[PDB]
Design a protein around this ligand. Sequence first.
Ligand SMILES: *[C@@H]1O[C@H](CO)[C@@H](O)[C@H](O)[C@H]1NC(C)=O
Length: 340
Amino acid sequence: LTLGNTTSSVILTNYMDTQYYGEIGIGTPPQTFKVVFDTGSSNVWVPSSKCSRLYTACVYHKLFDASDSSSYKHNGTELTLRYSTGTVSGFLSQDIITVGGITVTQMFGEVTEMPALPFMLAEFDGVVGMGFIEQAIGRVTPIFDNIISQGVLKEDVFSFYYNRDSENSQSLGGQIVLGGSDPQHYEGNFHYINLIKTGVWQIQMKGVSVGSSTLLCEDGCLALVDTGASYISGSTSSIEKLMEALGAKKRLFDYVVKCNEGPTLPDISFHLGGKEYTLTSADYVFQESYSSKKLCTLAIHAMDIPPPTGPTWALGATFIRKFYTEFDRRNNRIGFALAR
Ligand SMILES: *[C@@H]1O[C@H](CO)[C@@H](O)[C@H](O)[C@H]1NC(C)=O
């Protein structure tokens, strides 16, 4: 390891409280992309100029064109990246990547196959995996390990702030700090849990309360802390018992409640380290209306994550909006503080 004096921040955009992304530059001169920063994956990719326009997703996103980069280095190795909600495929390339102030030589996927569902619903183009090299497809070095290698970051950590959405332009959608936290977006103290293992941003969860009754994950279970997931997710069995306690109808791939019922829905707590992490109804309901004649989506959905990672709860954007999150690679722990 080597610690310098820099921290660097990335400004994020917030789309409808479901997508949080910022800007990176790839190549010389820079080609800019909107990318999700995702603690649940370890690869960088962006759509490629070599993606058939019969993939409608490649008609609607920014495409990396290697033929316009004087700093491109060929590799060409095929890879497939499986995400919870979809899959992309392409080949490895190397170029210079601009993220915050920071310039790093990085191996990434040029995606040539990008399915309409879900990528036509993406405001972002690509992904910067903030996971460990142990999960990296093609054993490629993740961008954060390559940034640590430079020895410029004050600390071997990064931090996520996800804001509530705005009707304003002037709202900061979110912020990643590389090498630190920003005390301007949290208050009180960080409270830390140690990872199960190095190699996955996953921690032990001791319980899940729905009011006063600890009626879920009663023994113990796993929480993946997933900056790239929109929702809080548990296992189909876990959720159908959560969603019974709340009084919510199962639809295709979300649960709903009558909009008028939304505000009187109970608190949901998550026991992590020595602290209860409590979300109000306002925190997990898309309160779009108060009518008995409309339906309102919950920001807790059902996801069966396959082994070895799973089966596990995932704490995504619904949870990070309330709790500023620090990802400590030096001490293999996660710190939560109350976001402001
Ligand atoms: C692709 O990259 C890896 C990573 O270092 C390297 O070991 C491999 O031989 C490369 N292949 C080509 C054809 O450039």
